[PDB]
Amino acid sequence: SAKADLEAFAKECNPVVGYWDPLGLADLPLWGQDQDAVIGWLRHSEIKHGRIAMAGFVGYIAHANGFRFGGIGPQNVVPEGASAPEVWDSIPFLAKLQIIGAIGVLEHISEDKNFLAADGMKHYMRGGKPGYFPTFSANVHPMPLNLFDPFKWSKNASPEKKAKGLVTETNNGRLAMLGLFGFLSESKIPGSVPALSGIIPSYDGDYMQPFLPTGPDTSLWTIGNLWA
Amino acid sequence: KAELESLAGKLNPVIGYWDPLNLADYDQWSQGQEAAIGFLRHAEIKHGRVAMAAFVGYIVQSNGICWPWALTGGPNGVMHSDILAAGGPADQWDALPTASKLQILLFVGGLELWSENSYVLGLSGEKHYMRGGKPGFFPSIKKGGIPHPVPFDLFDPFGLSKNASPEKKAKGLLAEINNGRLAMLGIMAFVSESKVPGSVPALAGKIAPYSGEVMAPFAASDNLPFVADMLKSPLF
Amino acid sequence: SDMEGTGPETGGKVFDPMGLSKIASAETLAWYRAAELKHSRVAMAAVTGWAWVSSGGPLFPGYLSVEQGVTFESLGRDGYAAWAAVPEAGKFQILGVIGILEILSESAVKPHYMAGGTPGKVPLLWDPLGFTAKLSPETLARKRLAELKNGRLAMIGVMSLVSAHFIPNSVPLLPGS
Amino acid sequence: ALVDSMEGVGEETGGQIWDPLGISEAVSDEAVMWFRASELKHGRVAMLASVGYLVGAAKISFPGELAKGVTFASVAANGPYQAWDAVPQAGKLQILSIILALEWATEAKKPHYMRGGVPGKIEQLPFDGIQGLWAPKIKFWDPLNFTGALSAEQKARKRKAELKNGRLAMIGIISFITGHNLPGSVPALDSSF
Ligand code: CLA
Ligand code: CLA
Ligand code: CLA
Ligand code: CLA
Ligand SMILES: CC(=O)O[C@H]1CC(C)(C)C(=C=C/C(C)=C/C=C/C(C)=C/C=C/C=C(C)/C=C/C=C(\C)C(=O)C[C@@]23O[C@]2(C)C[C@@H](O)CC3(C)C)[C@](C)(O)C1
Ligand SMILES: CC(=O)O[C@H]1CC(C)(C)C(=C=C/C(C)=C/C=C/C(C)=C/C=C/C=C(C)/C=C/C=C(\C)C(=O)C[C@@]23O[C@]2(C)C[C@@H](O)CC3(C)C)[C@](C)(O)C1
Ligand SMILES: CC(=O)O[C@H]1CC(C)(C)C(=C=C/C(C)=C/C=C/C(C)=C/C=C/C=C(C)/C=C/C=C(\C)C(=O)C[C@@]23O[C@]2(C)C[C@@H](O)CC3(C)C)[C@](C)(O)C1
Ligand SMILES: CC1=C(C#C/C(C)=C/C=C/C(C)=C/C=C/C=C(C)/C=C/C=C(C)/C=C/[C@@]23O[C@]2(C)C[C@@H](O)CC3(C)C)C(C)(C)C[C@H](O)C1
């Protein structure tokens, strides 16, 4: 069932390559959790990684070129021209904390059964659609508009168009993974990828530590800043 | 197979199937014997095609001929004739910066990957050259994939071989095999005349020295990993 | 006799130039396989350790015994020299844990390998996460054969390391130290 | 009861009765009930002793004052062995008085665990039904009804887990005391044991 769906999805991802599982990961029981749950977890991890890689690629370009939003906000502390690894080095430490906290809020909403049963669908490890983010009709206060389609551009497309969109999403995600780690590899070891040699400067800090260079405690707030 | 007897007879009616080593019986891949003759035939045809290409490249690169394009990369670099000013056509390959050789080798590798693919070969109508099929057949670059359309296919790009006579195609295959053997002899004669001066009756004092290895693609100027550690001991 | 272990590289047949079977019963062959499997697994662990420590490896970060003056990096990169630099408490702990584990392996399998059972199937210490909990019976035999072959190769590997340490310039790829 | 229909067994010793010396075969049923009661009391005492010894070895103390003039950390300023001698004698006497009352009331119950009772099944209210003595109905084991949500199979499994943990805890507390008294015997105790 899940394995045959993997074979089909790998066929429409690349008919020349097809199903490419050298390290047999579609057969390991992770938590003693059957086959279909493992397949759903692997697909959800792949799709989440791909989406984060695509967003990180665009954000890396925006930070390295210099694309500050405006005034007063946290961009005031970041110097004009620092390369993309250093814009997550000079924003306030509480700004990093609240960014990662909001990402965790989105993850929790994505896997909350109450948010998920409000849309009539189940967990991806329990027979759901991998990579599906639920709506917001479970919050306690009404949300203006959801996360997947913020406007109503979607919802009129055919299911075949949605399937082609999912295949394109997965392929673009894998390619963005490769591109973003090409950036990160050039930022650490010189001459890793040939095209980016001399484009991206070298970095000294740890890429896997969110708060090893802790940002300043600068309280960018006016009007009623009673918290010092 | 045993059909290669008749093919060897068609290549040369005087000397038929000539194999002192009896290499058609050698099952080097432990598949069927048909796979062994298929591999040998495909290897011979590919070797021959590469040899005619390399022979014509050697002939037109050995006497002051170079393209008037640039191959620079941005306000500096090779002028595309400084490689010609490095000696004969064996120092020229060892002077093509670093990325040029990498992209050439990767293009040939992707071309061979397109050659080997059974989904691409099966979509044209043939199979892999050892699992039956036709040896030396290059599948279409258009039908198999490549989502952006390309202008031409590799074999017969301009289309000047369509609706040809099938017996003329068989004669062309036999002529390809014979000219491939002859071109392998020619290109190895030239490569031997690079290093060894005393070889062959002809070609005396017409060939560049090339103090280096013909069989080493990457040169001492490459900044790839190892390489310099791999070139710390020459040979004969 | 028939057993596992045989395959290619011998012709699909049993390898024993010196006889060492036809004087062996089911019990003796079970002991042969149990000793072979234990030696194999110990040798695989031994090559995976000596190769990792001596060649490269980041080594364990930390201190190793806060009181005595020893550091993980102060042990060294040699195999035998660093083993002597391990403290006596650590050596005794390793040997005692191994002895407790094997005594419980002998007293825990009720069809004993010398009295039935399956040789080499010791209780505990295999997959706690159940990686091979879903494998087919046909595939498991392939993995057992791969374990046997890799273990024999690792036996030769550990003895190559021991020979290179003790008598120099033996095992020509291995250096003088 | 009979040693055959008891809950020790365990998969560590294969799945049969471990007894290598034949103690349970030479003695009658009453001695087996005494042995099981002593084993379970030993295991529970050793579990509490192991947890307390680890807490004392980690220099963890209560925030406050043990006796007026004696801080908890003042007693815990040394190892767990040299902490029992730093507790005032009155406090240790009160601890032993509560333990004496618990042991006496536990054994005073009816169907003694040799004479019909279950060995190791200490009943919930040892200080109930005693004339001239009153106590609240706090249960000894499970003052909170934790083992009321469990079924019979879960209770049997957790009883087996209790027996295994008791045996491990006896080994551990004997290791701790022997390592303190004879240093270098147990290599797992660095200095503060
Ligand atoms: C972390 C990201 C991630 C995740 C979770 C997945 C997950 C999956 N991929 Mg996928 N993939 C990725 C990135 C990822 N992919 C990238 C970057 C590419 C492009 C190269 C692909 C290309 C790809 C193809 C072509 C196919 C899959 C397929 C699959 C599915 C099953 C096959 C499998 O074993 O998994 C993939 C295996 C892993 C993620 C391995 C785990 C990571 C290991 C432990 C670390 C290895 C690090 C090491 C240094 C890498 C060495 C690289 C080099 C030296 C060789 C599964 C859902 C198959 C499919 O379509 O099913 C849907 C399939 O045919 N993947
Ligand atoms: C004093 C504590 C104590 C007591 C009273 C018991 C009592 C019992 N155990 Mg038990 N056990 C203990 C400690 C104890 N155990 C420890 C620490 C372990 C871990 C090794 C075990 C492991 C164990 C297993 C695996 C099994 C039992 C079983 C049994 C029951 C039947 C065996 C019998 O008749 O022996 C009666 C025992 C005695 C009369 C105790 C004599 C002790 C002598 C006098 C001292 C010897 C100690 C020795 C020097 C080692 C000390 C050092 C130590 C730290 C290593 C019985 C109720 C079996 C069972 O429940 O089956 C139903 C069973 O299968 N026990
Ligand atoms: C064999 C059992 C045993 C023995 C003899 C000791 C002996 C000692 N402990 Mg100790 N302890 C034990 C078990 C034991 N501990 C356990 C299991 C724990 C973990 C909870 C602790 C935690 C502990 C701390 C945190 C401290 C001591 C301290 C001390 C010393 C002073 C006496 C004292 O204040 O008692 C206090 C003993 C306890 C609080 C343990 C109570 C044991 C009962 C039976 C458990 C009751 C169940 C329940 C979970 C408790 C909370 C219920 C409540 C919330 C309703 C003395 C050396 C103090 C010290 O370092 O010296 C001054 C100190 O500060 N102990
Ligand atoms: C001054 C010494 C003294 C005195 C006057 C008594 C008097 C009595 N004991 Mg007694 N006893 C003593 C010392 C003493 N005991 C000691 C040292 C022990 C050994 C620990 C015992 C053990 C003992 C047992 C085991 C029993 C008695 C019982 C009795 C009662 C017999 C009939 C009766 O009234 O039952 C009716 C019972 C009552 C009316 C109970 C009321 C008694 C309460 C506790 C008075 C409260 C006193 C108050 C707390 C102040 C005392 C301070 C002190 C703790 C420092 C009688 C009141 C029997 C009995 O039934 O009493 C429970 C009984 O079973 N005693
Ligand atoms: C030899 C050498 O070094 O070569 C180098 C060359 C070079 C270039 C340096 C390298 C690189 C970097 C690379 C290749 C990086 C790739 C990055 C990549 C591939 C980034 C994808 C982004 C996709 C996004 C953001 C999707 C948005 C999607 C959006 C906004 C939507 O969802 C909208 C939409 O869906 C709706 C809502 C409905 C649909 O109906 C319509 C659409 C679809 C519009 C390498 C790898 O290092 C190799
Ligand atoms: C009518 C029709 O079908 O249309 C088309 C369709 C079709 C099929 C697509 C065609 C095509 C494709 C093409 C472009 C084919 C090109 C083939 C090519 C390029 C073939 C080179 C061979 C080079 C050789 C043999 C070199 C020998 C070299 C020799 C013999 C030596 O040097 C010998 C020698 O060194 C020794 C051994 C020792 C020395 O002492 C002496 C010398 C130096 C003498 C055709 C054929 O154009 C016809
Ligand atoms: C359900 C079930 O199956 O239960 C399970 C329970 C449990 C705990 C999980 C199990 C386990 C596993 C474990 C951890 C077992 C551990 C066993 C362990 C650790 C046993 C140490 C012994 C140390 C000794 C005897 C020290 C001797 C010391 C001696 C003999 C001396 O040196 C004394 C002496 O120097 C003096 C003092 C002076 C003079 O007098 C001279 C001499 C030399 C004589 C089991 C076994 O699997 C069974
Ligand atoms: C001064 C004063 C006080 C005060 C105060 C107060 C009330 C301070 C309040 C500060 C406050 C209230 C700060 C909010 C920040 C909200 C942010 C950053 C939200 C971003 C939200 C974003 C970026 C949402 C984005 C998206 O939703 C979009 C748009 C579409 C969806 O599809 C997808 C998601 C969900 C991602 C005292 C001291 C308490 C009392 C005193 O008397 C007066």
Can you count the helices (H) and strands (E) in chain C?
Answer: 4, 0
CB neighbourhood size of A153 (10 A): 8
Residue D134 known to bind ligand:
no
Q: Map residue D67 onto helix, strand or coil.
A: strand
> Which residues in A lie closer than 8 A to residue B98 (C-beta atoms)?
194
How is residue B195 annotated by DSSP? Answer: H
Tell me the CA–centroid distance for residue D175 and ligand 7, in Å.
9
Distance CA C175, CA D92 (A): 66
Question: Can you tell me which residue has the tokens 């003039």?
Answer: D69
What sign results for the dihedral spanned by CA atoms B8, B9, B14, B18?
A: positive
CA distances from A73 to A83, A227, B36 (A): 19, 17, 71
- Amino acid occupying residue A193: V
Residue C31 CB-half CA count within 13 A: 9
Cβ–Cβ contacts within 10 Å for residue B114, how many?
Answer: 19
Q: How far is CA B61 from CA A172, B66, B72, in A?
A: 43, 7, 20
- Both structure tokens of A131: 């990579």
Q: D139-146: long-range contacts at Cβ-Cβ below 8 A with a sequence spacing of 24 or more? A: D140/D102, D140/D106
Rounded to whole angstroms, the Cα distance separating B141 from B117 reads 12
Pocket of ligand 1 (CB under 6 A): A 6, 9-10, 13, 17, 19-21, 23, 25-26, 42-43, 45-46, 49, 174, 177-178
Tally Cβ neighbours within 10 Å of residue A52: 15
Count of CB atoms within 10 A of residue A87's CB? Answer: 21
The three-class DSSP label of residue D93 is helix
Q: In angstroms, rounded to a whole number, what is the distance separating the alpha carbons of residues A86 and A84?
A: 5
Ligand with the closest atom to the CA of A105: 8
The span from the CA of A10 to the CA of D16, in Å, is 52
Instruction: List, in order, residues 6 or more apart from A28 with CB less than 8 Å away.
Output: A38, C131
B193, B77 contact by CB (below 8 A): no
Q: What is the dihedral of CA D110, D111, D113, D117, to 10 degrees?
A: -130
Which of A71, A94, A87 minimizes the C-alpha distance to A218? A94
Question: Distance from the CA of B120 to the center of ligand 1, in angstroms?
Answer: 23
What's the rounded Cα separation, in Å, for the pair C36 and C30? 10
Closest CA to B153 of B168, B143, B164: B143
Cβ–Cβ < 8 Å for A220, A91: no
The radius of gyration of chain C's CA atoms, rounded to the nearest angstrom, is 19
Q: Which amino acid is at C70?
A: V
- Give the integer Cα–Cα distance in Å for D43 and D164: 9
Q: C147: exposed, middle or buried (C-beta count within 10 Å: 0-12, 13-18, 19+)?
A: middle
Strand partners, D71: D65
Sign for the pseudo-dihedral over CA of C13, C17, C19, C20: negative
b (16+ CB within 10 A) / e for B57-69: ebeebeeeeeeee
Facing D12 at nearest CB: one of C65, C89, C104: C104
The DSSP code for B69 is -
Tell which atom from ligand 5 comes closest to the C-alpha of A58: 25
Contacts of C174 (CB under 8 A, 6+ apart): C160, C161, C164
User: Which of C79, C6, C7 minimizes the C-alpha distance to C36?
Assistant: C6
Query: Which tokens in the block code for residue D192?
Result: 């503060």
Look at ligand 3, atom 1, and give the residue with the nearest C-alpha. Answer: D49
The residue whose two tokens read 């791909």 is A50
The amino acid occupying position D101 is A
Distance set, CA A216 to CA A8, A94, B75, B165 (Å) = 50, 9, 43, 80
Give the containing element (helix H, strand E) for C86: none
Encoded tokens for B88: 């004969």
In terms of DSSP bridges, do strands D70-71 and D65-67 run parallel, antiparallel, or are they unpaired?
antiparallel
Q: Where are the alpha helices (DSSP H) in chain B?
A: 4-11, 33-61, 99-116, 118-124, 166-195
3-class secondary-structure state, position D137: coil
Helices in chain D by DSSP H: which ranges? Answer: 23-26, 29-57, 72-75, 81-84, 89-107, 152-181
Which residues have a Cβ under 8 Å from the Cβ of C118 and sit 6 or more positions away? C111
Q: Tell me the two tokens of residue A80.
A: 């004009």
Q: Which chains touch B (3 or more CB pairs under 8 A)?
A: A
Say whether D66 sits in a helix, a strand or coil: strand
Residue with tokens 């996460």: C129
Tokens of B204: 């005396």
C-beta separation of B220 from B231 below 8 A: yes
Q: Which helix (H) or strand (E) holds B230?
A: none
C133 vs A contacts (CB less than 8 Å):
29, 32
Resolution in A: 2.8
- Of the candidates D113, D108, D102, the one whose C-alpha atom is nearest the C-alpha of residue D138 is D102
| A67 membership: H or E segment, kind and range | none
Contacts 24+ apart (CB under 8 A), C127-134: C130/A29, C130/A32, C131/A28, C131/A29, C133/A29, C133/A32, C134/A27, C134/A29, C134/A35
Residues of chain C immediately before an interruption (C to N > 2.5 Å): none
**Do D14 and C108 make contact, defined as CB atoms within 8 angstroms?**
yes
Query: Which residue's entry shows tokens 């494998």?
Result: C135
Tokens of B79: 């002028």
- Read off φ and ψ for residue C73, nearest 5 degrees: -75, -15
Contact C108 D191 (CB under 8 A): no
CA C92 to chain centre: 19
Cβ B48 vs Cβ B184: under 8 Å: yes
Residue B11 tokens, joined: 């290549």
- Angle formed at CA B117 by CA B115 and CA B121, multiple of 5 degrees: 80
Centre of ligand 5 from the C-alpha of residue A22, in Å: 25
Partner-chain contact B144 A191, CB within 8 Å: no
- Alpha-carbon distance of A35 to D144, in angstroms, equals 40
A190 touches chain B (CB under 8 A): no
DSSP reduced 3-state for C166: helix
By CB atoms closer than 10 A (0-12, 13-18, 19+), residue C54 is middle
Handedness of CA B151, B157, B160, B166 (dihedral sign): negative
B102/B225 Cα distance (integer angstroms): 13
Backbone phi and psi for residue C108, each to the nearest 5 degrees, phi listed first: -105, -20
B141-149's contacts with Cβ under 8 Å and 24+ in sequence apart are B141/B114, B144/A16, B144/B114, B144/B117, B144/B119, B144/B120, B145/A15, B145/A16, B145/B120
Is residue C122 a contact partner of residue C105, using CB atoms and an 8 Å limit? yes
Contact A173, A45 (CB under 8 A): no
Q: What are the tokens at D27?
A: 């003695």
Cα(A74)–Cα(A218) distance, integer angstroms: 9
The one-letter code for the residue type at B230 is: M
The residue among B122, B152, B170 whose CA lies nearest residue B3 is: B170
Q: Confirm if D190 and C67 have CB atoms less than 8 A apart.
A: yes
Positive/negative CA dihedral, B68, B69, B72, B76? positive
Contact B129, B41 (CB under 8 A): yes
Nearest chain A residue to B114 by CA distance is A16
Element (H, E) at D71: strand D70-71
* Contact check, Cβ <8 Å, A32/C131: no
Residue A142: burial class (beta carbons within 10 Å; 0-12, 13-18, 19+): exposed
Is the beta carbon of D174 within 6 A of some atom in ligand 2?
yes
SS3 state at C40: helix
**Nearest 5 degrees, angle CA A159-CA A114-CA A129?**
25
Q: Which residues of C touch A23 (CB under 8 A)?
A: none
Measure CA A123 to chain center: 19
Contact criterion met (CB < 8 Å) for A27 and C133: no
Can you say whether the dihedral through the CA atoms of D96, D101, D102, D107 is positive or negative?
positive
Report the C-alpha gap between A108 and A9 in whole angstroms.
27
Helix runs in D108-151, H state only? none
- Is B41 annotated as ligand-binding? no
Nearest Cα neighbor of A172 from A88, A55, A61, A67 is A55
| Residues framing ligand 3 (Cβ under 6 A) | D 48-49, 51-52, 55-56, 60-62, 66, 72, 75-76, 83-84, 87
